[PDB]
Scaffold this active site. Sequence first.
Site, PDB file in Angstrom:
ATOM      1  N   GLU A 141      61.140  18.336 -61.073  1.00 41.53           N
ATOM      2  CA  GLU A 141      59.703  18.394 -60.822  1.00 41.53           C
ATOM      3  C   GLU A 141      58.835  18.201 -62.095  1.00 41.53           C
ATOM      4  OE1 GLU A 141      59.228  21.948 -58.366  1.00 41.53           O
ATOM      5  OE2 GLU A 141      60.639  21.072 -56.926  1.00 41.53           O
TER       6      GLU A 141
ATOM      7  N   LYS B 210      63.787  26.317 -49.206  1.00 42.70           N
ATOM      8  CA  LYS B 210      64.000  25.951 -50.617  1.00 42.70           C
ATOM      9  C   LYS B 210      64.411  27.192 -51.452  1.00 42.70           C
ATOM     10  CE  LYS B 210      61.832  23.468 -54.407  1.00 42.70           C
ATOM     11  NZ  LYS B 210      60.622  22.723 -54.809  1.00 42.70           N
TER      12      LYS B 210
ATOM     13  N   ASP C  36      58.364  14.995 -52.594  1.00 45.10           N
ATOM     14  CA  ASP C  36      58.312  16.280 -53.256  1.00 45.10           C
ATOM     15  C   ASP C  36      58.626  17.253 -52.135  1.00 45.10           C
ATOM     16  OD1 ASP C  36      57.648  18.746 -54.371  1.00 45.10           O
ATOM     17  OD2 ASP C  36      55.512  18.345 -54.492  1.00 45.10           O
TER      18      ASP C  36
END
Lengths: 381, 113
Positions: free
Chosen positions: A175, A71, A10
């Site tokens: 996600e 990100k 993740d």
Amino acid sequence: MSKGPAVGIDLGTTYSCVGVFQHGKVEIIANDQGNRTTPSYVAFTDTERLIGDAAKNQVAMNPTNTVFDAKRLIGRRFDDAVVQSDMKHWPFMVVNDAGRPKVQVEYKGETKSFYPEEVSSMVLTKMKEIAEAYLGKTVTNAVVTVPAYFNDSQRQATKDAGTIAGLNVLRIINEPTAAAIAYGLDKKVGAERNVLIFDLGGGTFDVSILTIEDGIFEVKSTAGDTHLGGEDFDNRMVNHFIAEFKRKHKKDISENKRAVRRLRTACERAKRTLWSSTQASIEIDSLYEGIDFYTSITRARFEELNADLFRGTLDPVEKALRDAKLDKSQIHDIVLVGGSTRIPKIQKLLQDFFNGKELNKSINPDEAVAYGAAVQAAILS
Amino acid sequence: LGSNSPQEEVELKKLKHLEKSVEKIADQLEELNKELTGIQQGFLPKDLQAEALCKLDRRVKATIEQFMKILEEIDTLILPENFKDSRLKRKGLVKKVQAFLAECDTVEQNICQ
């Protein structure tokens, strides 16, 4: 070292997490400092490059050369509204290289610039090293997650980060899909299932509605707030305490950066205590002008201070339901992701909205996405 | 008075460990203070003194951060009114760290000017 299993990663805005499926279950892997999540931070110094906890730990000493939030920039154009808005709040420099953003830092006495996928590749390299240190075996294969709203360029740049890191990216999965997979939602017998993923962690708030039909996941809607998290809840506590210190001692501690930091760190810890206790105590000797600050806060007071923020998390849920063309009564499963979902008031507001429906929350919220990615990695190996 | 409890021994041991950690950081500050005095009162050409002072920057910032992390660890302690010896030790340690921080701030005022 011999060849190891495939892992799930993740890659988060502020923290990243790596898991591995073995012995019939997922094990979330602790890093070299014993932490099950790792800051998505990279620091450049006079003598070396630091990643993860080592980079986060020296941010106060080297703020301009410590990169985070890669990100938020990955796969974006320099002129993207998000890049221009975000740049105002970062202590590091972001420059335009032929329409593409680059972070600019001082490294070993020289000016260097890196693409966001290069910064994310260094974070991915650390996650790969974390897995290898635990397993005692080489790790090459991984499933990496991305937000459901990421476009083609953002998805491709993430894949590029994996390749640069020397990972064989088995698949890139969303996600909310990873979270649903962790709970085995795709495995429930019957017709199509409507799933709401409530993700409040790592500085972002994301609500996603997915429909699962014959094991196929379809994203129906996404909603949220790009800059909402624990720091906002902690801040309300800090304001409350600063005002309390003014009332009690007629002194303003706000301009003393060290006193505010000691107070903020104590508030962050008190907020975590309030996840399982109804009261938290704080004792700070010589906080400001030699005055000792001994106080406490109840869970009820914490909730009152954050009332508008907590209630406001239901607006995105309503917006996602409207965009997915579904009544709330049509939602089969609710999944909690992200550290802030541990707040009992947030769980209560969501359970009350869904008329008493039980929440999928047994998996640590900070780890659920890595957990699902680790299950996916095992299936693809 | 004279109601010393086994429980307080646990808090006193935590504080002693913190005291030892402070001593290690204070040894780093002592070396910085000696180097700063050595440059200010030494025989380096006035043209090279600025560079020598500037080289202490990374180390003083690292020392300040180590002291701040000690203060954050001390701030996790909860000591009841009855634990008088632990409260005195905690107060004395915080004041010692704060005095050290003030010496770090003096170093910062004398370098990279």
